[PDB]
Amino acid sequence: AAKDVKFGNDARVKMLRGVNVLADAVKVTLGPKGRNVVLDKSFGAPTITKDGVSVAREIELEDKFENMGAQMVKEVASKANAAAGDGTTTATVLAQAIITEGLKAVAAGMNPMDLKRGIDKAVTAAVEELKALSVPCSDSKAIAQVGTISANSDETVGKLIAEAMDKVGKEGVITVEDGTGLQDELDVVEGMQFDAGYLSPYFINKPETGAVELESPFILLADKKISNIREMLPVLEAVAKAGKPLLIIAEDVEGEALATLVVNTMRGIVKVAAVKAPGFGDRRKAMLQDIATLTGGTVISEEIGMELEKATLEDLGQAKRVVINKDTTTIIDGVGEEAAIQGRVAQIRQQIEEATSDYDREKLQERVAKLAGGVAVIKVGAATEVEMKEKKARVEDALHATRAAVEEGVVAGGGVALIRVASKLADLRGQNEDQNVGIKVALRAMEAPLRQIVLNCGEEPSVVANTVKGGDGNYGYNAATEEYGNMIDMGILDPTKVTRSALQYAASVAGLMITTECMVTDLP
Amino acid sequence: AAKDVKFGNDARVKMLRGVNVLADAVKVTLGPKGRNVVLDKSFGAPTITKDGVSVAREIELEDKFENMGAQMVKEVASKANAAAGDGTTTATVLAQAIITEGLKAVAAGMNPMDLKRGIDKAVTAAVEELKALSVPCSDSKAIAQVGTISANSDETVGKLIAEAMDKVGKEGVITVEDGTGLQDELDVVEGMQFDAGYLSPYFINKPETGAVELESPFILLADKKISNIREMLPVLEAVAKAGKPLLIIAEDVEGEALATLVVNTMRGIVKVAAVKAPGFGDRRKAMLQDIATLTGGTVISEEIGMELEKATLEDLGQAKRVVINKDTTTIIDGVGEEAAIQGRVAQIRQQIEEATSDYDREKLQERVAKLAGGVAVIKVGAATEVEMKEKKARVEDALHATRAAVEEGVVAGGGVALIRVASKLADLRGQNEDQNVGIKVALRAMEAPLRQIVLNCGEEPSVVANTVKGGDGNYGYNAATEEYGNMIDMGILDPTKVTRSALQYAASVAGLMITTECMVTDLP
Amino acid sequence: AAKDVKFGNDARVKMLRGVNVLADAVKVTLGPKGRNVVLDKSFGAPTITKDGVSVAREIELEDKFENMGAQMVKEVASKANAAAGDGTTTATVLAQAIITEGLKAVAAGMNPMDLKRGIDKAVTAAVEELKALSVPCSDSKAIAQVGTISANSDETVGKLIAEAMDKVGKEGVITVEDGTGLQDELDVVEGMQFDAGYLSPYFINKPETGAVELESPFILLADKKISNIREMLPVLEAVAKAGKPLLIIAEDVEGEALATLVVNTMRGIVKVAAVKAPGFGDRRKAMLQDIATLTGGTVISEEIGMELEKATLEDLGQAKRVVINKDTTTIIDGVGEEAAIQGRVAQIRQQIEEATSDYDREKLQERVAKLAGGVAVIKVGAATEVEMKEKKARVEDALHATRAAVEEGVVAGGGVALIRVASKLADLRGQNEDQNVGIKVALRAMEAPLRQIVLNCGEEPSVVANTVKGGDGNYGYNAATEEYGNMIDMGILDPTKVTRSALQYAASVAGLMITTECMVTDLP
Amino acid sequence: VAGGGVALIRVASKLADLRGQNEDQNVGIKVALRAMEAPLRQIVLNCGEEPSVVANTVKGGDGNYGYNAATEEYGNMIDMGILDPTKVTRSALQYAASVAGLMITTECMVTDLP
């Protein structure tokens, strides 16, 4: 329909104003002296929260252009949180800093594409320097230490995490669920994890973790695109009877079928989810098959002449739990026979001896690792149901932290790593003075989270920032205790991955916005 | 009374808008393709003019703040025309280039005071480079070429000026007056020119050159400050009788006496002008006495006990002509007997011998220079009164220009000198990035005059500018003939003094405006 | 006070709308079928008029810009009437056509200066062409013919003007005055006409012709500038008591004295008028003396030491009538002895023999022509006073027409010479396509008077115009008779001077407006 | 042909002497010639350079000489790897001029009421 179309400075200030509302709303929550945000709800009492991700979720603006701004950086920053388990809020205040001074510089008549180049140069630089600051977390004493810090100095969580990683490997799949008792349990069950996200942001029944969670679900495995719910109806109804939920895995799910699944599971008739079967070509078919073996189900392909209408509940797979993210699907405790599964692992494992191609061999190795390796399950013990659910959420958080730490290490928390790393790049230069400005802009922006934190405390950010800049390595300001020192020793730290991811995603969306000349939107 | 006070950005945009009205009105007249500005008059038919000084005079804005800006660059710019006899328009469009980009920078958060220091650096640099580019004007051939060119290719005027200078020297006083008839006269008469300005405007009966002109006046010499016109009455009413005008020379003319003199001569009775006695302290008295000897009048000092009341008509000296500029008073053909005059020069020239200091020697030598050197007078003829006044005007112009050219040289006209000189400064740096921006701001500003000229010419200013940059020396674009080449050979040139004056004053008021944070005016 | 400043397109359309009101009001009177305009008067009945000069005189506009426009083309076109005795209405509609199509071009992006250049070239060409077209008017038969035509086919007026032009020459001074009744007298008297204009309006007692008229005046001749009414009082009161008017001729009359003359004669006390002494330099004194000898008056000069205070009535010169234009003084029947006059003539005439150069010779001959030639006087006979002032008017008009006819000749009237001459220039070109458009613009503009004339007739302009273009020489359309043919034979013709003047002046003001970029006026 | 806009401006620079049957037609020709410089100019402007200047320098050259905006370097565009298939440059021009012609010769427009 008819559009409102804005160009140049006109468009850029609308964007600025929008992300300014987003970031200003979200950054009051940052750090240990972080303040509270009140989020209304139609039914009942308001929400009082310090979780900036919760806040961001709620921010939508009435100006169409301002809203585009806020929604843009919203979507780019949630990627930080999806990749590292954290950093979305951070990414947002960085983005706001880079955009603010970036556009200041644009309006001053400097060249956007060069400002963006300078910025991206400083960010590449900074990420190398981050890799230089990063303390390795490799042996399980260190895994335990980081788990502990992210559980709030609770050593039991560090211990638990470390035990699970000891069972299934640093690489392994680990989940948390409610306990059987006052004591913790750790059990490895047959299971898999692979990259398939929800095909719709709906299906989400656990909005906290942005997760789809299904208990004792049916699993449909079909190699085909499904564009019409017509094919589906006999099976769907077969499921409505059985009164358990349904996971769909196919080459894709499009149009009518997808919309009808959005609507039907919004209305309560047969709660269903859908994910894109991983890979393409013959590997897609193989991976589909592996999941079939794992869940005791059977695959439906047209290539053998099978059809979706002729499907029954017997062809369906089943597991105790499935969990589906933005980007990932996890199948926990499938039903399939250990003979069939181990047999299948054998097939694959021999296929690996026979493999003439490096790529074939790697891919086969991925498949077996997933199949043989299974899933570790942490069952959290506590005295009360509340001490329990509290511990359990602490352990999920610690789990994401620990994993990120194993991959890329830890660095000074409290936004000091960024300000440190920035301080090392003062003599960095680009091709022309515009690019140079781009660099100094990104560098000043890397001081924003520390400054925000400090401000929330009440102290002067200019002074604290200047002091931290004065020092070396992991020297910084512990905002909790208002005391300077070594941040890693004081147990204030971020996984190197979340700091890196925050910086990069911020820098991405800021770069795009700076180089935007035109915004087109619907009419009010 | 109640004030309106604006701060920072608010103030700076109001100023900016002001100087943009001024410059944009004035600058359409720039160069050979310059357009016409139409200035309304209360009584009669409108004025159509390409003279930018005349346009600026009429410019006053309704918004008090905007108006402050306009008037600021107006008053500083006028000083160019005052020092070198041309270049006020140039200074205005330069000031607009500098202010526009400078404020642009200030809103980007660069430091105003650093911007200013960088700008002033560029200006100093460019004045040096300008001195290097200047081609000397010394021998009468060159003098006559410059005259001829400022006379609109009239070789008679160039020849005439070169001849007048040939009689009285390069340092010589030269005046022009109406002609007795056809052809031309050149005559050396006794007279002097000293630095004293008019003590009020509104004295001006010749608004086209902005000067007071009095013919066969009585010259009153008084050493004192005259604060009361009660002392003046016998003298004013004494000169009313004779039918002649009156020139007041005093230590000053202040307050009541000055307001009553301004009004009394503004009503058309006893035409009078007032100027300060040249110098200060003792040599002021000395000078007033040298003038006493020149005019055949007598000085009144309160020391010896003489009063203004007891002064009669013989006490006053009389000359054939007096001409009063902004800063200069020149007196032509006085009664004072050659016995008197030669006597005075003998006294002073013997004073020079006994001089212990170089300073005294040179001061007295300046007194005998002014007194003995005398005055060259050009009587400009024509066939009619019309052609006579016109050619007289072109002579006045060409004379000022040749004065200037003798002093500091000549450089390429059409604003190519500025753009050349700015091509040579690309490597000039300051103490910090902000100063560097200041520098580049000024250097880019220096392309404005040429660019305007080309624009008014129909052509593409960026292209011309670029071509000129790519060359060297007094190479430039001749805008009238659309042909590139040595500007001096093609007879397009400016006295270096006026180009210099223009850049310096433009930058002066610009730097002040960039460093202005607050404006205060009466309430609307 | 604060000004309103309009630029570029805004400015240009304001101007346009102005000259459209002026021209559209004025041009409905053009040609034989011309319409009536009604001009309101404060008291009583309105004026109804077909005279476009009147209509023009009344046109003033509310919008200060639009008014600026109207008053520009109004003041320039009035110059046409002023030089040729006709053409001001023409000049206005011509200027409207040029300005209209011209700005249309300016707003399509063509170069105003180039457009102007092309227009001026076309006009130059057209003026040559027009000189070629011109049929001479030399013999007295022809003179009488032209006067008869301009008198509304009154053969009497032609005969009269022809007899007068034979009395004093075709270069001679001819005055027309009230008659002794029902007889046409022609008499040659001692008398002079020279260039000096009234020094001030408000001297004017005949607002119709815009001229000063004085009967039995005293003539004061003084060589000096009079800025002070002090010296005048004895003679002003001597003439006061005499009950006769007074005319001042001096080097100038300035300031206090001119203002006092204005007011004192504005009050009905002792009518006085003043003009500059004709010529400049040394010649001014001899010419002044000539006027003295002619009027039997005596020159008062400071040279010999005379003062005005000691001047009596016998030193005063005398004529029967003096008449003062904007630019011209005519002295009719001076009383000076025919002896004195004749001997001054003798002296000048020998000064012509003693003269060294051609210049001196031709200026002297100017003097003796004025002095010796005298002034022809036409006393207009009629039966009643209405017929008398009416026929006097027709004779004044015819006399102007025949003077112009004698100087430059006559060309086809009714606006056909302009279109003829345009049709001959079809192949004219300039430097560039913008200049060419300029040329075509003026050429098409030259079709405007004819077309308008035709329009006032109720006929189709394009048809008659196209027909006239398809013809040769003095072939055209007679509007009155609706019939084609040789315009000269048909008796429809203009003096070449006026058609020339109109075109030249209209292209002047039009070229100014087209190249006008900025307008400045007071705030409403 | 040369990409990055320079084929169009090249070709335009060759047609300077081209005339039609009348002055209106002539203006038309110059209009399309001048319009043929718009893509190069826009490209340059997106870079931050002075379109007038780049364009003029390109007209000064011959054949597939042009300006590579990526690298700020003048030279042969084909050698430099910047090029358009001749079909698309020709098509773009012809379709542009078709719609533009239609629009110029449109005197009346008819649409629904708000």
PDB file of N, CA, C and O in Angstrom, chain C residues 359-376:
ATOM      1  N   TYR C 359      37.323  71.424 -32.632  1.00  0.00           N
ATOM      2  CA  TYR C 359      36.456  71.394 -31.460  1.00  0.00           C
ATOM      3  C   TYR C 359      35.987  72.799 -31.097  1.00  0.00           C
ATOM      4  O   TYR C 359      34.776  73.076 -31.072  1.00  0.00           O
ATOM      5  N   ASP C 360      36.960  73.677 -30.848  1.00  0.00           N
ATOM      6  CA  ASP C 360      36.701  75.063 -30.476  1.00  0.00           C
ATOM      7  C   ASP C 360      35.717  75.663 -31.471  1.00  0.00           C
ATOM      8  O   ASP C 360      34.732  76.294 -31.087  1.00  0.00           O
ATOM      9  N   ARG C 361      35.969  75.403 -32.749  1.00  0.00           N
ATOM     10  CA  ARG C 361      35.172  75.928 -33.857  1.00  0.00           C
ATOM     11  C   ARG C 361      33.705  75.505 -33.775  1.00  0.00           C
ATOM     12  O   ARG C 361      32.793  76.321 -33.977  1.00  0.00           O
ATOM     13  N   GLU C 362      33.479  74.232 -33.461  1.00  0.00           N
ATOM     14  CA  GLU C 362      32.118  73.692 -33.419  1.00  0.00           C
ATOM     15  C   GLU C 362      31.335  74.101 -32.160  1.00  0.00           C
ATOM     16  O   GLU C 362      30.107  74.259 -32.214  1.00  0.00           O
ATOM     17  N   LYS C 363      32.038  74.288 -31.041  1.00  0.00           N
ATOM     18  CA  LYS C 363      31.395  74.791 -29.818  1.00  0.00           C
ATOM     19  C   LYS C 363      31.005  76.271 -29.957  1.00  0.00           C
ATOM     20  O   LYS C 363      29.890  76.698 -29.565  1.00  0.00           O
ATOM     21  N   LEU C 364      31.922  77.050 -30.526  1.00  0.00           N
ATOM     22  CA  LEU C 364      31.635  78.446 -30.840  1.00  0.00           C
ATOM     23  C   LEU C 364      30.435  78.537 -31.790  1.00  0.00           C
ATOM     24  O   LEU C 364      29.495  79.311 -31.550  1.00  0.00           O
ATOM     25  N   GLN C 365      30.442  77.730 -32.849  1.00  0.00           N
ATOM     26  CA  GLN C 365      29.310  77.756 -33.775  1.00  0.00           C
ATOM     27  C   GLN C 365      28.000  77.365 -33.085  1.00  0.00           C
ATOM     28  O   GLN C 365      26.943  77.901 -33.429  1.00  0.00           O
ATOM     29  N   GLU C 366      28.056  76.458 -32.110  1.00  0.00           N
ATOM     30  CA  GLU C 366      26.868  76.180 -31.298  1.00  0.00           C
ATOM     31  C   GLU C 366      26.370  77.469 -30.648  1.00  0.00           C
ATOM     32  O   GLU C 366      25.155  77.787 -30.680  1.00  0.00           O
ATOM     33  N   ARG C 367      27.313  78.225 -30.082  1.00  0.00           N
ATOM     34  CA  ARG C 367      26.944  79.477 -29.417  1.00  0.00           C
ATOM     35  C   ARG C 367      26.258  80.476 -30.366  1.00  0.00           C
ATOM     36  O   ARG C 367      25.174  81.001 -30.053  1.00  0.00           O
ATOM     37  N   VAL C 368      26.867  80.732 -31.524  1.00  0.00           N
ATOM     38  CA  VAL C 368      26.279  81.716 -32.439  1.00  0.00           C
ATOM     39  C   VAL C 368      24.968  81.227 -33.037  1.00  0.00           C
ATOM     40  O   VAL C 368      24.104  82.025 -33.374  1.00  0.00           O
ATOM     41  N   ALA C 369      24.813  79.920 -33.177  1.00  0.00           N
ATOM     42  CA  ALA C 369      23.562  79.401 -33.696  1.00  0.00           C
ATOM     43  C   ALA C 369      22.441  79.731 -32.718  1.00  0.00           C
ATOM     44  O   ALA C 369      21.390  80.255 -33.112  1.00  0.00           O
ATOM     45  N   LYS C 370      22.678  79.437 -31.440  1.00  0.00           N
ATOM     46  CA  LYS C 370      21.668  79.717 -30.428  1.00  0.00           C
ATOM     47  C   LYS C 370      21.314  81.198 -30.393  1.00  0.00           C
ATOM     48  O   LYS C 370      20.145  81.564 -30.444  1.00  0.00           O
ATOM     49  N   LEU C 371      22.344  82.036 -30.346  1.00  0.00           N
ATOM     50  CA  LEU C 371      22.191  83.482 -30.155  1.00  0.00           C
ATOM     51  C   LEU C 371      21.587  84.220 -31.347  1.00  0.00           C
ATOM     52  O   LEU C 371      20.640  85.005 -31.194  1.00  0.00           O
ATOM     53  N   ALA C 372      22.154  83.967 -32.528  1.00  0.00           N
ATOM     54  CA  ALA C 372      21.701  84.573 -33.787  1.00  0.00           C
ATOM     55  C   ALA C 372      20.360  84.038 -34.284  1.00  0.00           C
ATOM     56  O   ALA C 372      19.515  84.810 -34.739  1.00  0.00           O
ATOM     57  N   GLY C 373      20.175  82.721 -34.200  1.00  0.00           N
ATOM     58  CA  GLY C 373      18.964  82.078 -34.687  1.00  0.00           C
ATOM     59  C   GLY C 373      17.649  82.517 -34.063  1.00  0.00           C
ATOM     60  O   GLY C 373      16.617  82.551 -34.735  1.00  0.00           O
ATOM     61  N   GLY C 374      17.665  82.837 -32.774  1.00  0.00           N
ATOM     62  CA  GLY C 374      16.447  83.268 -32.113  1.00  0.00           C
ATOM     63  C   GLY C 374      15.404  82.170 -31.991  1.00  0.00           C
ATOM     64  O   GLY C 374      15.712  80.986 -32.116  1.00  0.00           O
ATOM     65  N   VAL C 375      14.162  82.574 -31.751  1.00  0.00           N
ATOM     66  CA  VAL C 375      13.080  81.642 -31.438  1.00  0.00           C
ATOM     67  C   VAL C 375      11.806  81.951 -32.214  1.00  0.00           C
ATOM     68  O   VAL C 375      11.260  83.054 -32.105  1.00  0.00           O
ATOM     69  N   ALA C 376      11.332  80.980 -32.995  1.00  0.00           N
ATOM     70  CA  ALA C 376      10.055  81.110 -33.701  1.00  0.00           C
ATOM     71  C   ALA C 376       8.860  80.902 -32.758  1.00  0.00           C
ATOM     72  O   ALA C 376       8.844  79.991 -31.936  1.00  0.00           O
TER      73      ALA C 376
END
